[PDB]
Amino acid sequence: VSEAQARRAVADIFNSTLASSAIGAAWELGALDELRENGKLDVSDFAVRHDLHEPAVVGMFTALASVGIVRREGATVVVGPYFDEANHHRSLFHWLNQGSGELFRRMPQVLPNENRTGKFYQRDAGAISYACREISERYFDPAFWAAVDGLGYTPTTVADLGSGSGERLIQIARRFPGVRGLGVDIADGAIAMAEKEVAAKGFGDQISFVRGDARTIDQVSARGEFAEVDLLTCFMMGHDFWPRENCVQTLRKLRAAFPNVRRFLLGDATRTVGIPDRELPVFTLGFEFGHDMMGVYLPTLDEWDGVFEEGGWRCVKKHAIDSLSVSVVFELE
Amino acid sequence: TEVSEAQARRAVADIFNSTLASSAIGAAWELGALDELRENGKLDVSDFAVRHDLHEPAVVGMFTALASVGIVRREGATVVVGPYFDEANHHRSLFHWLNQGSGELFRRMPQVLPNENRTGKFYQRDAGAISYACREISERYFDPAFWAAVDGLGYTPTTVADLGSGSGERLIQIARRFPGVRGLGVDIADGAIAMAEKEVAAKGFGDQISFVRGDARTIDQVSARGEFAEVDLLTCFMMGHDFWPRENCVQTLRKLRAAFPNVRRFLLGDATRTVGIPDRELPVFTLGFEFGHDMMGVYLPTLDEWDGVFEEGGWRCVKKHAIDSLSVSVVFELE
Numbered sequence: 001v002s003e004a005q006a007r008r009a010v011a012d013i014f015n016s017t018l019a020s021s022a023i024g025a026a027w028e029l030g031a032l033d034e035l036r037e038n039g040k041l042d043v044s045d046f047a048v049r050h051d052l053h054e055p056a057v058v059g060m061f062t063a064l065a066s067v068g069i070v071r072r073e074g075a076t077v078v079v080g081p082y083f084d085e086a087n088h089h090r091s092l093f094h095w096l097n098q099g100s101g102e103l104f105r106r107m108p109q110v111l112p113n114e115n116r117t118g119k120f121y122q123r124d125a126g127a128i129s130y131a132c133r134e135i136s137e138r139y140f141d142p143a144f145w146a147a148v149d150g151l152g153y154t155p156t157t158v159a160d161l162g163s164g165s166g167e168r169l170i171q172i173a174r175r176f177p178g179v180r181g182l183g184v185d186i187a188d189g190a191i192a193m194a195e196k197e198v199a200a201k202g203f204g205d206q207i208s209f210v211r212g213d214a215r216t217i218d219q220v221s222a223r224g225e226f227a228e229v230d231l232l233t234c235f236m237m238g239h240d241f242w243p244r245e246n247c248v249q250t251l252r253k254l255r256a257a258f259p260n261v262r263r264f265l266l267g268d269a270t271r272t273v274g275i276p277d278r279e280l281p282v283f284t285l286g287f288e289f290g291h292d293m294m295g296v297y298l299p300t301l302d303e304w305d306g307v308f309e310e311g312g313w314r315c316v317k318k319h320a321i322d323s324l325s326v327s328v329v330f331e332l333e
Numbered sequence: 334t335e336v337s338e339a340q341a342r343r344a345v346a347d348i349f350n351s352t353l354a355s356s357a358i359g360a361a362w363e364l365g366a367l368d369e370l371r372e373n374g375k376l377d378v379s380d381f382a383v384r385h386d387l388h389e390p391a392v393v394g395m396f397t398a399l400a401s402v403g404i405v406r407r408e409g410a411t412v413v414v415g416p417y418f419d420e421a422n423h424h425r426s427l428f429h430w431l432n433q434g435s436g437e438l439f440r441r442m443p444q445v446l447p448n449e450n451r452t453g454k455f456y457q458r459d460a461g462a463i464s465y466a467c468r469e470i471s472e473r474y475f476d477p478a479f480w481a482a483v484d485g486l487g488y489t490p491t492t493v494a495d496l497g498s499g500s501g502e503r504l505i506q507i508a509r510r511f512p513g514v515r516g517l518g519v520d521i522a523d524g525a526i527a528m529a530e531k532e533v534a535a536k537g538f539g540d541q542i543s544f545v546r547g548d549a550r551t552i553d554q555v556s557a558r559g560e561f562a563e564v565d566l567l568t569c570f571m572m573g574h575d576f577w578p579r580e581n582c583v584q585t586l587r588k589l590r591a592a593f594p595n596v597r598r599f600l601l602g603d604a605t606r607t608v609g610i611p612d613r614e615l616p617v618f619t620l621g622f623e624f625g626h627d628m629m630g631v632y633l634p635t636l637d638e639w640d641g642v643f644e645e646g647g648w649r650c651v652k653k654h655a656i657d658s659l660s661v662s663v664v665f666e667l668e
C-alpha cells in the first residue's frame with residue numbers, strides 16, 4: 001500500500017529477473033551443487049577453479065543474494081533461506097531463461113497477429129534438452145520407473161517421441177542391455193545433443209535418432225524400423241499433438257505405425273484451471289503463457305482422459321506428479 | 334518448518350513469476366497497455382486485443398503475468414491497475430532495457446562467464462530496443478538536470494555533438510529549443526543510427542541533424558572529422574562509462590578537448606557504480622546496470638572515480654547534479 005512498499009516490491013521484481021536467470025546459470029556452471037555440498041564457497045576460488053570472469057561471478061552471486069537464495073559474507077557465498085527450494089526447481093528456471101528466454105523477450109513482436117506466420121519466435125533447442133534431462137529425473141522419474149517396472153515384459157526395441165537429450169533411451173538401455181533404441185525429434189539442436197551423448201556414453205551402436213515430426217509419424221523417414229518397436233515413450237510433448245481431433249488422429253497413426261508396441265508411456269504437464277493469479281506456483285505461468293505465445297494448445301488433464309479410447313488406446317494406469325504444475329504419466333495399452 | 338517451507342515455496346514461485354512480469358512490463362509499455370491503464374485505470378482485454386490486433390491468449394498471459402506480482406488485477410473481462418502499477422509504470426523503461434534490450438546478454442550467462450569464450454562478439458543485445466528504452470530513460474530521469482544545465486550554458490549553441498546519440502531525441506529537442514542549430518550524433522551501433530535517422534526525418538530535422546557510425550572512445554578515427562571544429566556544445570549521456578578504465582578515459586577526454594576546440598560546455602550524464610548497498614536493499618536498476626556491464630567486461634566507475642579524472646583529462650567540473658531513482662546517476666557540467 002505505501003509508496004515505500006511499492007518501491008521495494010518493484011525493485012524485487014527487477015532483481016528477481018536477474019536472480020532467475022542466474023539460477024539456471026549457477027546450476028549449469030556448477031555453483032549450486034558446490035553450495036549444496038559445502039554450504040558455502042569462496043567466490044574468487046570458484047572463479048579461478050572454473051576459469052570464469054570473476055567480476056561477473058560476483059554479480060551472479062549478488063543476483064542470487066538479492067532475493068535470499070544466497071547470503072554473501074565478505075568473500076564468502078553462503079546458502080540462503082530459499083536455497084533448497086530454488087535448487088530443487090533449478091531446471092525449471094533454466095528452461096524459462098536459458099531455454100525459452102528469446103520467446104518471452106520478444107513479446108512485443110510475438111503478440112501482433114500480422115507477425116504470426118512461419119517462424120515467428122525462437123528458442124534454444126539444446127538448452128531445453130539439457131534442462132529437460134533434469135526435469136525428467138527430478139519430476140517424472142519415480143512415475144516413469146514405476147511404469148517401467150510394471151511393464152510385464154522385457155522390451156527389445158524402444159522408440160522415444162521427442163527424444164531431446166536422448167537420456168531416456170540411454171537409461172532404458174542401461175536397464176535392458178540387449179535393447180535397441182530409436183529417438184525421434186523435430187529439432188536439430190536436440191538430435192545433435194543426443195548423438196553426442198550416446199557416442200560419449202558408449203551406446204552409439206544401440207541407439208539412433210531421426211529428425212521427424214511425430215505429429216505426422218507415417219511421414220517419418222525411419223518407417224521400416226517402427227515394426228520392431230515393442231515399447232513406446234513420449235515425455236513433455238504430448239500437448240503438441242493437440243487440439244483434440246489432431247491428437248486423436250495422431251494417436252491412431254502411432255497405434256498403426258507401431259503395431260508391436262505393448263505399452264506406451266506418456267508423460268506431460270497439463271493446463272491448470274482456477275488457480276489465483278497471486279497463488280500461481282512455480283512453472284505453471286511460464287508453461288501456459290509460453291505455449292499461448294507459441295500458439296500451441298495445452299490440454300487439461302480432463303481432456304487427456306477423453307482421447308485415448310478414440311485414439312485406439314486403453315489407459316491402464318495414471319500417476320500424479322508432485323509440484324510440476326499439474327503433471328501426469330499415463331500407461332497406455 | 335511447515336509455515337516456512339510454505340514461505341520458501343511462495344518466495345521461489347514469486348521469483349519465477351517475476352521474470353515473466355518483468356518482461357511483460359516492457360512489452361505492455363511498447364504495446365500501449367501501460368499508457369491506457371494510466372489514463373483510464375482500467376481496460377477491457379478482448380477489446381484491447383482487437384484494437385491492437387494481438388493474439389488474445391497471449392495478451393491474457395501478459396496481463397496474468399503482471400497480475401501475478403501485483404502490478405495489475407484481472408476482474409472478469411477487465412484489467413485494472415494494481416497496487417504496484419504507478420511504481421512499475423514509472424520505471425517501465427528500465428524493465429524494457431533489462432529484458433527487451435539486454436535480455437539476450439543475461440540469458441547467455443553460462444556462455445558469457447567462461448574466459449575462454451570471452452573474445453570477439455561474445456554477447457549480443459538489441460541496440461534498437463536499447464535506443465527506444467533510453468529515450469524514455471533520458472526524458473524521465475535525466476531531463477530535469479539536463480535542462481537546468483542547458484539553461485545555465487551562458488550561450489546559444491550553434492553546433493552540438495552528441496556522443497552515443499542513440500534515438501537522436503536529445504539533438505531533436507535541442508533543435509526544438511534552438512531553431513536552426515546544427516547537430517551531429519555519433520553512435521557505434523547501426524540500430525541506434527537507424528532509429529535516429531528515422532526520427533529526424535519524421536520530425537523534419539534531417540535538414541539540421543546528421544549521424545555517423547563511429548567509436549567515440551577513439552574520436553580521431555570517427556570519420557566525420559570535417560564538422561568537429563565548428564561544434565560549441567558537447568553532450569554525452571549514458572555512455573561515459575564506456576570511456577573507462579581510467580587511463581583510457583583520461584586519454585579520451587583529452588582527445589575530446591582537442592577534437593572539439595570550440596566546445597564551451599560539455600554536459601556529461603551517466604549512471605555510476607555504487608558501493609556498499611546491502612544485497613537485499615538494492616533499488617531498481619542498480620544490479621542490472623552493474624552486473625550487465627561486468628558481464629560485458631566494461632569498467633564502471635564510481636562517482637569519485639569520475640571526480641578524480643576530469644583535470645587530467647583537460648576539463649574543469651563546475652557543477653554536479655544528482656538524479657532521482659536511477660541507481661546513483663549524475664550530470665556533470667564541464668568547462
Ligand SMILES: Nc1ncnc2c1ncn2[C@@H]1O[C@H](CSCC[C@H](N)C(=O)O)[C@@H](O)[C@H]1O
Nearest residue numbers: 132162163164185186187213214235236237
Ligand atoms: N512435433 C514434434 N515431433 C518430434 N519432436 C518434437 C515435436 N515437437 C516437439 N518435439 C521435441 O520434444 C522435446 C520436448 S522436451 C522433452 C525432451 C525429452 N523427451 C525428455 O524427456 O527429456 C523437444 O526436444 C522438442 O524438440
Ligand SMILES: Nc1ncnc2c1ncn2[C@@H]1O[C@H](CSCC[C@H](N)C(=O)O)[C@@H](O)[C@H]1O
Nearest residue numbers: 467497499520521522525548549570571572
Ligand atoms: N564507444 C562508443 N562510441 C559511440 N557510441 C557508443 C559507444 N559505446 C556505446 N555507445 C552508444 O551509447 C548509447 C547509450 S544509450 C543512451 C542513448 C542516448 N544518449 C540517450 O540519451 O538516450 C547507445 O546507443 C550505444 O550504442
Ligand SMILES: C[C@@H](C(=O)C(=O)O)c1ccccc1
Nearest residue numbers: 095128132135236237268269
Ligand atoms: C519441454 C517443456 C515444453 O512443453 C516446451 O518447451 O515446449 C515442458 C513440457 C512438460 C513439462 C516441462 C517442460
Ligand SMILES: C[C@@H](C(=O)C(=O)O)c1ccccc1
Nearest residue numbers: 430463467470571572603604
Ligand atoms: C544505456 C544503459 C547502458 O549503459 C547500456 O545499455 O550499456 C544505461 C546507461 C546509463 C543509465 C541508464 C542506462
Ligand SMILES: O=C(O)[C@H](O)Cc1ccccc1
Nearest residue numbers: 304305308315316317318330
Ligand atoms: O482416464 C484416465 O484417468 C486415464 O486416461 C488413464 C486411466 C483410465 C482408467 C483407469 C486408470 C487409468
Ligand SMILES: O=C(O)[C@H](O)Cc1ccccc1
Nearest residue numbers: 639640643650651652653665
Ligand atoms: O569533483 C566533483 O565533485 C565534480 O566532478 C565536479 C565539481 C567540482 C567542484 C564543484 C562542483 C562540481
Ligand SMILES: [Ca+2]
Nearest residue numbers: 102122123124
Ligand atoms: Ca534462442
Ligand SMILES: [Ca+2]
Nearest residue numbers: 176177178179
Ligand atoms: Ca535385456
Ligand SMILES: [Ca+2]
Nearest residue numbers: 212213219220
Ligand atoms: Ca516428418
Ligand SMILES: [Ca+2]
Nearest residue numbers: 375376377411
Ligand atoms: Ca473497461
Ligand SMILES: [Ca+2]
Nearest residue numbers: 636637640641
Ligand atoms: Ca567526490
Ligand SMILES: [Fe+3]
Nearest residue numbers: 236237239291
Ligand atoms: Fe511444449
Ligand SMILES: [Fe+3]
Nearest residue numbers: 571572574626
Ligand atoms: Fe553501458
